[PDB]
């Protein structure tokens, strides 16, 4: 497989005007996170074909990250190295995703 999955790596615990402000901050926090992960994927593991940060239950609280590397080789090596790294105070749980 060329795709790897970083399990529950995207965390995010805690009117009208409040909703709009909340939407913006979440979006900016999402984009910051994305760039953060994407850049590292390309910098140390290889060329990324596709990448997405998911919202598992739909509550924006937790999500997986999927990275499709152009090369099956890069993917397999990323999984091994990533499983030996920390991310935001938690160990990473990497896995090849069929």
């Amino acid at each position: 497989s060329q795709t790897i999955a970083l399990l529950n790596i995207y965390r995010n615990p805690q009117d009208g005007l409040r909703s709009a402000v909340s939407d913006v901050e979440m979006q900016e926090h999402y984009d910051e996170f994305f760039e953060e992960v994407f850049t590292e994927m390309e910098e140390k593991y290889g060329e990324v074909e596709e990448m997405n940060v998911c919202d598992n239950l739909g509550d924006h609280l937790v999500g997986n990250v999927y990275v499709k590397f152009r090369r099956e080789e890069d993917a397999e090596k990323a999984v091994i190295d990533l499983n030996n790294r920390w991310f935001n105070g938690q160990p990473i749980h990497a896995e090849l995703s069929p």
Binding site: N83, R85, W86, N88, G89, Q90, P91
Partner: peptide, 23 residues
Amino acid sequence: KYWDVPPPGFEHITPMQYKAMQA
């Protein structure tokens, strides 16, 4: 900001040794 930031107090063991204790 995120990369390689270990849980407080566990910088001296590896992520794999930390995960081994999770259940």
